[PDB]
Design brief:
Chains A, B, C: It is found in: Cytoplasm. The structure is cut from a larger assembly and holds 3 copies of chain A (about 450 residues). By secondary structure, chain A is of the alpha/beta class. Chain A contains 14 helices and 19 strands. The first copy, chain A, has 2 domains: about 140 residues, Leucine Aminopeptidase, subunit E, domain 1 (3-Layer(aba) Sandwich), CATH 3.40.220; about 300 residues, Aminopeptidase (3-Layer(aba) Sandwich). The complex binds chloride ion (15 copies) and potassium ion (K) (9 copies).
Chain lengths: ~450, ~450, ~450
């Protein structure tokens, strides 16, 4: 596997010097060796002069530094690593910002490095044969950063797993494929258990909304539950709900919901978090316009928009998970294109029926720099999905407050939970980058770690 | 004019009873007179039984009550008022919610009544000949509500004026027409003064962005400044900047920016606020794709989107107002259609480069229930308007984070102010209601009143 | 200015080693210094180890090498040059392909280097302040390459000038601006003379097609002629005709036609070619659908497509240039979007009414690797522009054989010349690269040089 260690000097054959612009001069003294690299944000200079390779990466000035953009900077170094085929790297952070707290910066540096050196060649004939085998984090200060490195490593491992699942094509990534992934993941840890419903079970429960979305398909619906019993027995679990509609459209809406749940379950299992968590996945493949379905809850839904099938899967799943008597429920869905227009790729939009939960997610977002922006769950917009023939419509007649309307639809099914909804259409896919990001795995693991600490 | 008085009993020939559902029974005792009206939110029952007419209007239960929707409820009564031709009305609020603070509820009731009985028949041959001549607010409690009524009245007067200006057609509402409105408004109050630039003056200042938007038109550009010297001489003014691009398109983007500035200037003049305020209006009428302009600031702007001309007018105006050395600058623009998708009609989206200012606007929004939602001014999205041939583009190449991008463009021109930008495309026009609302006049007057009090 | 010299060893402080993969080993012996760079096509490795910087640039294997793509490879080195701020560079070509003839490779290397280090910051506030000041071409063989370097230099100077003109925005690049460029260029060389027609002159000649295209605009039409009298007096000139419709649309059709004429006139003036050449520019700015115009030739043209105005300018200009009694006439026009669909960015599509001329252009294209593909001037497609009300239509009723139809339209005006038409919509702009290329300046200068040699 990947070796992550921490040390107070650099001992590998290649080194990556991460340099704040205000520390450039000091670095120069310790070393126009002087003039050539100015340590500007994202600037990269590989010095192959010594027998050992040295790559300088600039951060610019503290006052211009947006932490949420740090992956984009590390990306620059990661290209050089791949290009020079460097598999073992010492990462010296002594010349970064004095102000920044080292623990989070360590966590982030390790995470971004492992994340940005990710490669997908599963379906290619020519293999890249490149990956990092070792990172030696080099730090001279007095702070304990060992664990931070371990966590950033685990998270990056989960983001990359999420990326794998988002990158698979729909004909390979079938509902059976996903069900098998859940089996293979749960088999690897004694703390895991797997429960799931097939169509028959789902039909006995009256899950009319979710079953209708797959009605026409050859791929079976499944509601898959990975119970991670990290915490004390009987303590209420945190439930993560992911939407995994194969071949979903809004432009294409990928597996990001379930991909991030998988990625998050893997990470917390690796870190062995002392918290109870259930990862739940609603699986289906893509029932005419105007049909009326009966949800498990018993609310009748007129499906006015055939494009909006993803929410139908999420509503029955959200009703079903109530059995867990969850302390919190967070769902993740590449749910609306409106989200990209509202916030772009940088933020996951979030909606919550609980200020306490919203706050915790906001703290996790600040800590991890996996950015969220809360949007208002504005009840009067419920009128936009009144229906002539049914209890409610699934979608408004126009595009206005689209994401809000979608969250409101779901909110009819979650009134008994403390609940948050992350619309990750932008944050998971990009907005024209079109690249799997593995988000919001980092946010969720920070949130879960914070909840796990509150346990002790 | 309109008579607003306050009294502890009802003495006019028609009465409007505003009834919380929890107080229905109590109202019945004081009076199937019983069974017929249930005081549901917005329910209306006119009793023409007595010689005096009595209209009952329900509020539903406290726990279901969204204050920001109160105009929609009052609207129901206002239809009855017009239909029954009632010009003098006693408004009894003793049966409304006990919990609600009476002062704000009084202010809101008076405002909504005057606002919702608004009529526009200026260009019609058949006149409605309807308006409220007198409201007697009836309240039995110990709170002093006289002033609250006066304020709600002034605000509604400003909203209606704003509605008039939004409702005028572009061929009547010329830049000259607007300039004359500013003259007529400033002539009515000793506290007002008028300064303005014509094209020649604007060209001497190098206002290349704003001048370019009107370059082709017969209607002249103007930058119109209404200085309201309510406060102590030499105290830094609050500057309100409005975008008034005649015949603007994004669907059509109306005069809402300048209309709300006008409405706000009228209201604070009527209330005689002890605060220094300058209302500024950038006027122009609708220069090919790809042109490069030099702003007054000297930044060069490639105009990639011919639709996005409104921001060009706002940037030069924002630079120009710096002369005032304003304590705060708030601009208002029906700027993007993206806003309607993000938030719909209920919220003005806001962006701020100052947390202090954002907070004050958030307090005003809470107080008045003229809702705002802060969106993030996310600097990395500046990349979306990098330009090959110029300092910057005016618009991104796609629709993503559109409103944010527009705010970021403007933010390049306001780095020296505490500054907020209200995108009122949704809140001023509706999202398919398509009706002038006079917003955000109510928000701005609350904000200004709060600032005026902090003066003493 | 730029210093270009030739030498048999490298004497500047930075060096660029251009390395064929089959010569990598040999280079290594002369020098894992070994393992790291594999000389793959476009691979770049800057060695800042010595006091002098050394950049290695790979070509891959001879059998995989497409010469027309060489600029894309040089581009890789040019980024490093700019990034390391290297202004003086020795370019060693001894390790390139043995098979390639050195003269053309020298010409191409110099041209691509100067072309790919081009910067446009005319309208920017922040200047790049970067350009090559000196290239020392290093070659150990027995071939005389001095002149080749001079020519490649002149051509790159013309391509960059063309790029400048394509990159200017329409509001800066007015018909007056272009007329002034022709004045400034003709003033710099005794061999140049300037004749031109304004609108009045054009109207006396009956140029009804060209005048109609600008009829509505403020920018005047001009037909601008730069007579370059390099050759013997009285010898028939080669006429290059360029279409320069400001703000033209098809997506946007730029100044590429006149830009390349300008660039070509500059280059041959610098090289002092002993050939008679007239560069002619039809200038206008953007007359309803269905109008009938009388061309100078007297053919009546129904303008069915308002988008197709560019050809109307070209037809009157083509008639007019007959006065020169030209030996050959080549026109260049970003004329159809169809071209990009047919051939993409790599080829200029060409049409000719003369096999002799087509052949010469094909030889120039082979020599310079400024690629052309001849398309058929298929007379039966003349039926697609038959007109009910006029001699002919300007455009077909559908998109089929669009470029061919456009060439056929023009061919009605050139039956007395040996004539070629280059549709450079793809080759000048890119197809989503969207980048000015300065093509086909290189092709035209090779053609002209070849014609100049045939003179002696
Ligand atoms: Cl990994
Ligand atoms: Cl959906
Ligand atoms: Cl939507
Ligand atoms: Cl609850
Ligand atoms: Cl923990
Ligand atoms: Cl009024
Ligand atoms: Cl705009
Ligand atoms: Cl937009
Ligand atoms: Cl400030
Ligand atoms: Cl006050
Ligand atoms: Cl040059
Ligand atoms: Cl054309
Ligand atoms: Cl075509
Ligand atoms: Cl001939
Ligand atoms: Cl020659
Ligand atoms: K297990
Ligand atoms: K199925
Ligand atoms: K949308
Ligand atoms: K006055
Ligand atoms: K004008
Ligand atoms: K939009
Ligand atoms: K001359
Ligand atoms: K003209
Ligand atoms: K086409």
């Amino acid at each position: 596997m990947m070796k992550i260690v921490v040390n107070n000097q650099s001992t590998l054959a290649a080194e990556l010097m991460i340099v704040a612009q205000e520390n450039l001069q000091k670095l120069v003294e310790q070393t126009l060796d002087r003039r050539i690299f100015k340590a500007k944000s994202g600037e990269v200079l590989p010095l192959l002069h010594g027998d050992k390779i040295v790559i300088l990466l600039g951060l610019g000035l503290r006052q211009d530094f947006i932490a949420s953009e740090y992956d984009k900077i590390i990306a620059k170094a990661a290209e050089q690593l791949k290009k020079l085929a460097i598999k073992e790297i010492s990462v010296d952070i002594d010349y970064a910002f004095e102000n920044d707290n080292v623990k989070q910066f360590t966590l982030d540096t390790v995470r971004a490095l492992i994340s940005e050196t990710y490669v997908f060649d599963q379906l290619k004939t020519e293999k890249e044969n490149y990956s990092l085998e070792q990172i030696e984090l080099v730090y001279s200060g007095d702070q304990d950063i060992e664990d931070s490195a371990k966590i950033g490593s685990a998270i990056a491992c989960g983001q990359n797993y999420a990326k794998d699942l988002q990158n698979l094509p729909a004909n390979i990534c079938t509902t059976d494929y996903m069900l098998n992934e859940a089996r293979e993941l749960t088999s690897k840890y004694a703390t895991f258990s797997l429960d799931y419903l097939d169509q028959d079970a789902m039909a006995e429960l009256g899950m009319g909304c979710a079953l209708a979305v797959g009605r026409g398909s050859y791929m079976s619906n499944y509601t898959v539950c990975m119970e991670y019993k990290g915490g004390n027995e009987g303590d209420a679990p945190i439930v993560l709900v992911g939407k995994g509609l194969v071949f979903d459209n809004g432009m294409k809406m990928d597996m990001g919901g379930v991909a991030a749940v998988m990625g998050t379950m893997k990470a917390i299992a690796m870190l062995n978090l002392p918290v109870n968590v259930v990862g739940v996945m609603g699986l289906a493949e893509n029932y005419r316009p105007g049909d009326v379905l009966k949800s498990m809850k018993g609310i009748t839904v007129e499906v006015s928009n055939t494009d909006a099938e993803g929410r139908l899967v999420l509503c029955d799943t959200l009703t079903y998970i109530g059995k867990y008597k969850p302390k919190a429920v967070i769902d993740l869905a590449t749910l609306t294109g409106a989200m990209i227009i509202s916030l772009g790729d940088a933020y996951s939009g979030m909606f919550a029926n609980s200020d306490k939960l919203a706050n915790s997610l906001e703290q996790a977002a600040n800590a991890s720099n996996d950015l969220i922006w809360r949007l208002p769950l504005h009840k009067p917009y419920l009128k936009k999905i009144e229906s002539k023939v049914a209890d409610m419509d699934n979608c408004g007649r126009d595009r206005s407050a689209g994401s809000i309307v979608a969250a409101l639809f779901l909110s009819k099914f979650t009134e008994d939970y403390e609940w948050a909804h992350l619309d990750i259409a932008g944050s998971a896919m990009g907005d024209a980058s079109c690249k799997a990001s593995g988000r919001p795995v980092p946010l969720l693991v920070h949130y879960l770690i914070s909840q796990a600490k509150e346990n002790l």
